[PDB]
Design a protein around this motif. Structure first.
Motif, PDB file in Angstrom:
ATOM      1  N   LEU B  96     -25.451  50.779  15.295  1.00  0.00           N
ATOM      2  CA  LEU B  96     -25.946  49.539  14.805  1.00  0.00           C
ATOM      3  C   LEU B  96     -27.403  49.729  14.292  1.00  0.00           C
ATOM      4  CD1 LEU B  96     -24.425  47.464  17.684  1.00  0.00           C
ATOM      5  CD2 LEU B  96     -23.384  48.025  15.621  1.00  0.00           C
ATOM      6  N   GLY B 100     -29.276  45.133  14.677  1.00  0.00           N
ATOM      7  CA  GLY B 100     -28.180  45.033  15.606  1.00  0.00           C
ATOM      8  C   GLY B 100     -26.871  44.880  14.867  1.00  0.00           C
ATOM      9  N   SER B 101     -26.816  45.222  13.578  1.00  0.00           N
ATOM     10  CA  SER B 101     -25.521  45.160  12.898  1.00  0.00           C
ATOM     11  C   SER B 101     -25.040  46.540  12.589  1.00  0.00           C
ATOM     12  CB  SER B 101     -25.550  44.384  11.595  1.00  0.00           C
ATOM     13  OG  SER B 101     -26.855  44.304  10.978  1.00  0.00           O
ATOM     14  N   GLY B 102     -23.742  46.642  12.257  1.00  0.00           N
ATOM     15  CA  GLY B 102     -23.096  47.923  12.029  1.00  0.00           C
ATOM     16  C   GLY B 102     -21.841  47.623  11.219  1.00  0.00           C
TER      17      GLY B 102
END
Lengths: 8, 279
Positions: B96, B100-102
């Protein structure tokens, strides 16, 4: 869609 | 062992009653096992990780956690003070980005990765992988989790935080992994917790003090913070030789505190992670 969660 | 004025999730995981302030755990404390924190990174320099963390692979430019989430999760699974397993070895796999994204493929990739990579480490006691992340249902994402899990890793999986049925969320719904829900300290399902017939258990997820970047610390709330408690509970028991990667979940579930939680919907299990530490 991702944090499953906090603030950062 | 006891950790006085422990964080409450810590005291809870080792109490059969909400209310307490000491975390009681065996001293082996997770050592021998390894926990991949497949997340945003892990400030491996946190004095709280005493040197037991390390980035093993990113899928971005740095390896640094510029977010906090992972140091947080890493933290709860095994930071000295904030953690379940104070002696686990932690490896960061950074899937991520620092917000905090992936994408589902770099997390699929991070999952196939720890499945391979674990092969070239010394994790004598078991290997856990802790995925405090998630999204809308995807069968490849589930597939990845289930591959990782069948390849031998104990995948703990956040139910999600949408206070919905975890069925439409993915890892969450790979019935073969270990979807984790959150509770608050009064033994209520955390108001944000997902639930459903696919959840396997609950851990403390509300107001969770842990490691943070900057060498700091911070409380936050989430199924994201309960996962690492089962991830670390798992790891702590693997090294305790009580269960294996292939069954740590069922076992954690069978041995949990039952009927305690309030707020549980018909269909969802009333089970709270618990280590049965008897000194």
């Amino acid at each position: 869609p991702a944090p499953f969660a906090a603030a950062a | 062992a006891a950790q006085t004025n422990a964080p409450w999730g810590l005291a809870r995981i080792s109490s059969t009653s909400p209310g307490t302030s000491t975390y009681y755990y065996d001293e082996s404390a997770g050592q021998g096992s390894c926990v991949y924190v497949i997340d945003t990174g892990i400030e491996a320099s946190h004095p709280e990780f005493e040197g037991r963390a390390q980035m093993v692979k990113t899928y971005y430019y740095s390896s640094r956690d510029g977010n906090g989430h992972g140091t947080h999760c890493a933290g709860t699974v095994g930071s000295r003070t904030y953690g379940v397993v104070k002696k686990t070895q932690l490896f960061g796999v950074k899937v991520l980005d620092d917000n905090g994204s992936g994408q589902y493929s770099t997390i699929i990739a991070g999952m196939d990765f720890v499945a391979s990579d674990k092969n070239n480490r010394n994790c004598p006691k078991g290997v856990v992988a802790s995925l405090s992340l998630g999204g809308g249902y995807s069968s490849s994402v589930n597939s990845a989790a289930a591959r990782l899990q069948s390849s031998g890793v104990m995948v703990a999986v956040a139910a999600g935080n949408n206070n919905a049925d975890a069925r439409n969320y993915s890892p969450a719904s790979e019935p073969s992994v270990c979807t984790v829900g959150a509770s608050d300290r009064y033994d209520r399902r955390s108001s944000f917790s997902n639930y459903g017939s696919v959840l396997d258990i609950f851990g403390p997820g509300t107001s969770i003090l842990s490691t943070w970047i900057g060498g700091s610390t911070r409380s936050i709330s989430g199924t994201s913070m309960a996962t690492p408690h089962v991830a670390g509970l798992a790891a702590y028991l693997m090294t305790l030789g009580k269960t294996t990667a292939a069954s740590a979940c069922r076992y954690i579930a069978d041995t949990a505190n039952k009927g305690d939680l309030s707020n549980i919907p018909f269909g969802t299990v009333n089970l709270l992670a618990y280590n049965n530490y008897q000194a």
